[PDB]
Amino acid sequence: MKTLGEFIVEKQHEFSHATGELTALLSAIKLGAKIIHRDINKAGLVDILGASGAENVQGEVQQKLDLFANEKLKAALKARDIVAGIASEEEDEIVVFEGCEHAKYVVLMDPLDGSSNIDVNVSVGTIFSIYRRVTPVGTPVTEEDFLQPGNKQVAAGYVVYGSSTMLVYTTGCGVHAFTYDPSLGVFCLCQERMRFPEKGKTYSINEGNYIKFPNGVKKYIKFCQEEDKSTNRPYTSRYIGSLVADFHRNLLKGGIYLYPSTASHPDGKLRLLYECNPMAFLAEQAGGKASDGKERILDIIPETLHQRRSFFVGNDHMVEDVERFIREFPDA
Amino acid sequence: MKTLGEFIVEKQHEFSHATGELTALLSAIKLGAKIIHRDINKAGLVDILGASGAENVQGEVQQKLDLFANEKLKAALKARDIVAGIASEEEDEIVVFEGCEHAKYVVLMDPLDGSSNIDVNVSVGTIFSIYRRVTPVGTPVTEEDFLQPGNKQVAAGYVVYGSSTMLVYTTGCGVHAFTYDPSLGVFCLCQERMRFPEKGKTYSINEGNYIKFPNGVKKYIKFCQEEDKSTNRPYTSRYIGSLVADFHRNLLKGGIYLYPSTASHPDGKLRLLYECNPMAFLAEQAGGKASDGKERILDIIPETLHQRRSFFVGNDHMVEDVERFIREFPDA
Amino acid sequence: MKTLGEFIVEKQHEFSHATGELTALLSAIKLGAKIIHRDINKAGLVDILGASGAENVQGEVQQKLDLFANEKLKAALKARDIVAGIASEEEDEIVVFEGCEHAKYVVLMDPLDGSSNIDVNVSVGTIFSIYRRVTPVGTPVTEEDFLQPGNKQVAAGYVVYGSSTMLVYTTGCGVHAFTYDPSLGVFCLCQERMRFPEKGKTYSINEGNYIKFPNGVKKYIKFCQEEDKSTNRPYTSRYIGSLVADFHRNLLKGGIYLYPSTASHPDGKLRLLYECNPMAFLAEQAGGKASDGKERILDIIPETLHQRRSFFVGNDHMVEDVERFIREFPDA
Amino acid sequence: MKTLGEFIVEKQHEFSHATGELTALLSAIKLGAKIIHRDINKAGLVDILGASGAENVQGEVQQKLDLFANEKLKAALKARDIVAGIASEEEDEIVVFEGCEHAKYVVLMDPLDGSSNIDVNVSVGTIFSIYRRVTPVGTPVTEEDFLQPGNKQVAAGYVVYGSSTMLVYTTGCGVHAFTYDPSLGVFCLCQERMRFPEKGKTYSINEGNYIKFPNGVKKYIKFCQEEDKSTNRPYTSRYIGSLVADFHRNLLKGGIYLYPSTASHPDGKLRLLYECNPMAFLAEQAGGKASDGKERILDIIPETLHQRRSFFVGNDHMVEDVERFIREFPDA
Numbered sequence A, B, C, D: 001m002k003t004l005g006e007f008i009v010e011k012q013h014e015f016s017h018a019t020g021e022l023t024a025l026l027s028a029i030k031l032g033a034k035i036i037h038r039d040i041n042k043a044g045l046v047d048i049l050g051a052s053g054a055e056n057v058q059g060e061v062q063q064k065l066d067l068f069a070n071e072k073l074k075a076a077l078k079a080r081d082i083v084a085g086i087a088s089e090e091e092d093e094i095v096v097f098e099g100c101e102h103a104k105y106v107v108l109m110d111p112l113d114g115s116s117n118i119d120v121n122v123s124v125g126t127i128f129s130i131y132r133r134v135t136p137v138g139t140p141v142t143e144e145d146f147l148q149p150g151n152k153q154v155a156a157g158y159v160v161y162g163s164s165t166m167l168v169y170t171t172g173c174g175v176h177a178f179t180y181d182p183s184l185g186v187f188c189l190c191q192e193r194m195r196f197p198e199k200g201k202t203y204s205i206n207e208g209n210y211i212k213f214p215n216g217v218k219k220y221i222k223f224c225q226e227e228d229k230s231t232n233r234p235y236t237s238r239y240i241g242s243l244v245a246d247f248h249r250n251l252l253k254g255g256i257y258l259y260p261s262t263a264s265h266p267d268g269k270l271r272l273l274y275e276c277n278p279m280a281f282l283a284e285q286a287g288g289k290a291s292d293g294k295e296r297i298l299d300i301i302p303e304t305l306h307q308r309r310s311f312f313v314g315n316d317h318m319v320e321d322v323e324r325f326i327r328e329f330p331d332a
C-alpha cells in the first residue's frame, strides 16, 4: 500500500520540481474532499440537499452543497498558505487571499460538479486546475493569473464522490488515481498510469437536446447508432449527468463525452477554465484527446473568467470522428 | 432520528401483520447490504473488480462482486432462519435452505444490479422480492413458490450503493427510504412516503440500441426530443446504466426508465421475477406505472424462472405515452 | 464471521425460549451503544465533556455524557415496544413507558459507567440488567418489578467503550463477547464462552482509600503484596477507574475487582441493582464469584432502588481469600 | 475546526523554523497512528492479539501488535524521506535508512506502549522522540545521534488509542492535543496549550510491587494515603497499566505517574530514550516535572541505547514530594 502523500514524495521528478509545494496543494484538496465526502455520504440525513436561495454567477440556481463545497475548498486552500488566490465557478470575481501575496500558485475550481445529481444519490465531483502565477510575487494576483491558456497548467485533477471516493490528478507525467479508504482515513494509490484503452465503444451526451445540436454532432450521433461490428457499432450509451463521473468511466472503459452548443448554451454549457482545461489536461495525459469540436482546448486563449465552450473529450479516434463530421457538415 | 428497525416496529399495521418476521427479513437484507457496501466503498483497494471466470445462467460474463454479493445475501438470508429458500439472478436453480422447510417466505433477488458500473466507481444496487410460499410449510419449496405473479409480493425493495448507501422498500403501504449512516452504523429514515412528482421530464434509455427498438419506442424517443414548453419538452436524458440508480433518481425527480426489446434481447433484457416485479411493486406504491409496453408487469403469469421482459416504468403519464405509441406504431 | 443478531437466532435454547424478544431487547442495547460510541469516539471534538449542571439521585455531580447516554438508551428501549419500563442510576424514580403496559420485561441500567474517565479518553461502559416483570401484564410496572433479587435476572451484560467497542452479555448459558466492526457497522462474535482462567494474579482496587477499608480488606491487600512465587505473589495492580473496564480485563486475564465500604460510602459505593447484580450474574456465568464480602450478591433481597453494597468479584479463589480475611479480621 | 496539518502551517515560529519538515515528520506519525488504530479498533475480529513468538531486546515476550506497530511506523518514517534512521524499543540496533544519509533527523520510538493492555481492550499508545542528528549529513547516522540527552529533543509526543484516538506533541512551545475524527479521517485540534492544573490529587503506580520499592517511595505512598483535607489527601489511585494513558489523564486532571526501581528492574522498568525523555519533554512543556527521583530526566547523559531509569512525572509539587521522601529516607 502507498498513500497519496508518499506517492508525491516518491515522484520527485514530476511537478517541475517542488515536492513540498505539491504536497501542500494536494493536502488542501484532499482535506476539502474529505469534508465534502462526509456530508454527501450522509446527504439524506444531513440538511444539505436543495437550493441555497442564491443564483450562480453562471445564472444558475445554486444548491446548498455547491456553496458548502465552495467555502470548504476555499478555506482549505487559504489555510495551506501556498496559494495567492482562487477562481471558482461559484464566484463572480477572483478571490485574492489576504496575506498570501507571497504565494506563487493560483487554483481554479469547480467545487461541486454535477449539481443535478446531489439530491438523487448519484455521483458528483470536484475539479481543480493549478497554475503558476504570472504577476510579480509579493503582489495581489489579478485576473491575468487566471486567464492563462490550458497548456500552462502545472497540475489538474478531480475528486469523484461515487460508490467510493477517488482523487485523480496529473502534473504532466501521466494520470494517477487514488481511492479513499474510510477504514484508514487516507487516500491510497490504486492506479499509477491510467490510459484510455485502445478503442472506445461508449458515447456520453444528453440526447434530449438532439434537435438543437450542431448538424455535425447530430450526424456523429447517428453514426454511433449504425450497426457495424467491424468498428464495435452501435456504441453503448451512458450519461450519468455528472462530468467528472462520465469522464472517469470513459477513461477506464474507453469512450467519449460530448457537450456541444445547444439553444440554451450557444457556446456549449461547460466553462473553459474550471471544467474544460483541467479535464483536457487529464484526458491528454491519458493518451486521449479534447477539443471544442475544431481546435485544441488547451491552446485556446481565454477571453473571460466565465467563458463557456463546446467540449468533446475521450479516446482520440472518437473525438477525431466528431471533428470530421462537424467538418463535413458545418452547421449553416 | 428513527432507525429502520424502529420504523418496522412502529408500522405494525403494514406487512399483513408479522412485525417480527419483517424485522428478521430486512435485518438479513441490511446485513448483506452492509457487507457489500464495505467492499464497494473500497473497490479500488480491494480485489473484487473484474470477471470471476464464470458465466451467468443469464449467459453473461459474471463479475467478482456479483458472486460475492450473491453468496453474502444468500448466507445472510439462511442465517435468519426465516426464509425457506431463494431464487437469484446469479443461480441456475432455486436454492432450498436445508433445515428451513418450516420457513414460510421465499426471496427472489438480483444481488448486484448494474454489473457494468462496478469497476468504474458508478452506482450499483441490490434488488429483492419477497413472497409468501404456496407449498405446504414443513416441505421444501419448489419453483412453484418462485413463479408467482408480481401482484402476490408481500414486500419488495432495493439497496442503492451510490454517493451514500440507501435502502428503499415497500410492503404495500407506500415506499420508504432509509440512508445508512457510517457514523452510527445504522439505517435511518429519510423519507417515509416517496411519491413520483406530478410530472416527469427525464427519460432513461440506452439510445445506442436505437435502430433495433420497436418502432413505437423509436417514435416515443423522437417525441421526447421535440420542442414543446407546454409539456416540458424536449426532456432531459439520463442513463446511469444501473437500473436501481436510474429508478431512484426518476422516483425523486420524476421520469421514466425504458428497456425494450433489442436485437440481442428479443424479449427485453431485464428479468421478470428478479428485476421487473419488485421495481414495479415499488413504482406502483409511489403512484407510478410499470408495464411491458402493453400489459401490467405485476399481473403477468411467469413462465420460467429466468424469463425476460420489456420494461417501461416511472411517471404514469410518461409510461402511458410509451404504451400509446407502441399502440399507434405496432412493429411489423 | 457471525453477527450478534445471528448468534441470538442460533442459540434458541437460551433465554428461556423467547428468541424474538431477546433480539428486540439487545437490538435496543446496541443501537444505544452505537449512538453513545459515536459521541465518545470523538469526545474532544464534540461538546459532551463536563458537568451537565445537575446532581445525580446518587448525590453525584452528573457529567453531560451520563445524561446523553441515559436519554438515548431510554428512548431506544421505549421504541422497541418490548419493555414496560426502566430503572436507571441517573433517575430518581422508575420510568414507566406509556403504552407499554403490555410489555413483560423491565430493564435496569447504568447508562454510563466510569464517569470520571469520560474527559480523559479512558475506557467507560454501559451496564444493563433485564428482569421479567412480576406485576400483571397490562398494568403499569411498579418498584416491585425492579426490586427483585439478582438471581431472578433473565439477562445481563455490558458495553465497553475502549480501544474498540465490545458488547458482553449472558442469559444464563455462559458469557458471550461481541466486537463492533466500524467497517461493517455490526457487532461480530469474538468469543462465545468466556471463562476466568484457572488462576488470577491481579487485584483492582482504589488503594488511595486504604486507611478507611475494613481491616479484613487491608489484610487482603497486604497479602497481595507479599512475595510468594508458589502462589504468584505479589500480584500485579491494575485499576482503570471504570468498573466495566477493570471487570473485562479481569475476566480475560484473571483477577479481582474490589470496592469495599469507605468513609464516604459506608455501604460500598456501587449500587446493588444497576451495577452489582448484572456484573455478578456475568462473573458467575464465567465460573467466577461475586459477593459483598460475606454473602452472595445475587441472593440479596434489595431494600431500595438505589441501595449500595460492598462488591468483590472475579476469580473464585481470590474472592474466597477476601471473604476469609474479613472473617478472620472482622472490623470492630 | 483546524486540522493538525493546518496548525503546523500556522505555528511557523515553532520547531526552530522548518515548517515543511515538521509536516513531513508528523505526517508519517499520523499515517502510522491511523494504520495502528485500524487494527486495534477491531482487535477482537483481527488476528493481532497474542505473542508473536519472539523476545524483545528488552528481554520481554513480544506481542503481535508490538511488531506490527514497529514495522508500520518504521516504513512510514522511511517513506517520507525525511529521517536518516530510527531507534526503537522493539529493535536491538539502530535502523539506518538506506538512501536517507541526506536526512538530518532521527526518531526514537516506543511503537506500542502498554503491551499488557492490547488483548483486554484497554488503552495503549505510541511514543516518539525526534532529534536533529549530530553526525555529518550525507553519512549514515550512528548510535551517537541516538544517545543525545533529552534536553536536545526538537520534538516529542504520543498517540493514545483509547475511547478516541488522540495525538499529543510539543516542539518546545507548549503541548498540543489533536483528536482523530473517523467521520473525516483527519486529526483536529482540541486543545492548543495543555497544562497541568494547579494541584494534583491522583497517584499512578503499580502498588503490587510495594515491598520492593525504595523506602522513600514506600513513604510517599503512605503519605498519599493519609487523611488531610487541607492538602486533598488521601489521593485517588489510578493505574491503567499503560504509560501513555496514565500520563494523559494526569496531564488533564492532575496527578503523578511513578515507576521506581523494583526487584525485577533494579534501574526502573521504563527506558530512558524511548519512554522517559519524550514524556519528560512533554510534562515540562505543560508546566510539570519529570525526574528519576533525584535528577532531571532531560539532562541525564544516556549511556546505552536501551538504558532503563526510574521515572516520576506529573505535577511539580507531587514530583517534588517524591524527591523529598527519597532524600529523607535513602534506601540503604
Ligand SMILES: O=P(O)(O)OC[C@H]1O[C@@](CO)(OP(=O)(O)O)[C@@H](O)[C@@H]1O
Residues within 6 Å of the ligand: A112, A113, A114, A115, A116, A117, A206, A241, A242, A243, A244, A269, A270, B236
Ligand atoms: O443537465 P445537462 O444539460 O445534461 O448538463 C449536464 C452537465 O452539466 C454539468 C455542469 O457542471 O452538471 P451540472 O450543470 O448539473 O452541475 C456537468 O457536470 C454535466 O456533465
Ligand SMILES: O=P(O)(O)OC[C@H]1O[C@@](CO)(OP(=O)(O)O)[C@@H](O)[C@@H]1O
Residues within 6 Å of the ligand: A236, B112, B113, B114, B115, B116, B117, B206, B241, B242, B243, B244, B269, B270
Ligand atoms: O448495458 P445496457 O444494455 O444499457 O444494460 C443496462 C441495464 O442492464 C442492467 C442489468 O441488470 O445492468 P447490468 O446488465 O450491467 O447488470 C441494468 O441494471 C441496467 O439498467
Ligand SMILES: O=P(O)(O)OC[C@H]1O[C@@](CO)(OP(=O)(O)O)[C@@H](O)[C@@H]1O
Residues within 6 Å of the ligand: C112, C113, C114, C115, C116, C117, C206, C241, C242, C243, C244, C269, C270, D236
Ligand atoms: O473514584 P473511585 O472511588 O475509585 O470509584 C471508581 C468506581 O466508581 C465508578 C462508579 O460507577 O466509576 P464512576 O463513579 O466514576 O462512575 C465505577 O465505574 C468505578 O469502578
Ligand SMILES: O=P(O)(O)OC[C@H]1O[C@@](CO)(OP(=O)(O)O)[C@@H](O)[C@@H]1O
Residues within 6 Å of the ligand: C236, D112, D113, D114, D115, D116, D117, D206, D241, D242, D243, D244, D269, D270
Ligand atoms: O506491568 P507493570 O510492571 O505495572 O508495567 C506497566 C508499565 O510498563 C509499560 C512499559 O511500556 O507497559 P508494558 O510493559 O505492558 O508495555 C508502561 O506502558 C506501563 O506504564
Ligand SMILES: [Mg+2]
Residues within 6 Å of the ligand: A110, A112, A113, A114, A243, A275
Ligand atoms: Mg461542473
Ligand SMILES: [Mg+2]
Residues within 6 Å of the ligand: B110, B112, B113, B114, B243, B275
Ligand atoms: Mg440487475
Ligand SMILES: [Mg+2]
Residues within 6 Å of the ligand: C110, C112, C113, C114, C243, C275
Ligand atoms: Mg457505573
Ligand SMILES: [Mg+2]
Residues within 6 Å of the ligand: D110, D112, D113, D114, D243, D275
Ligand atoms: Mg512503552
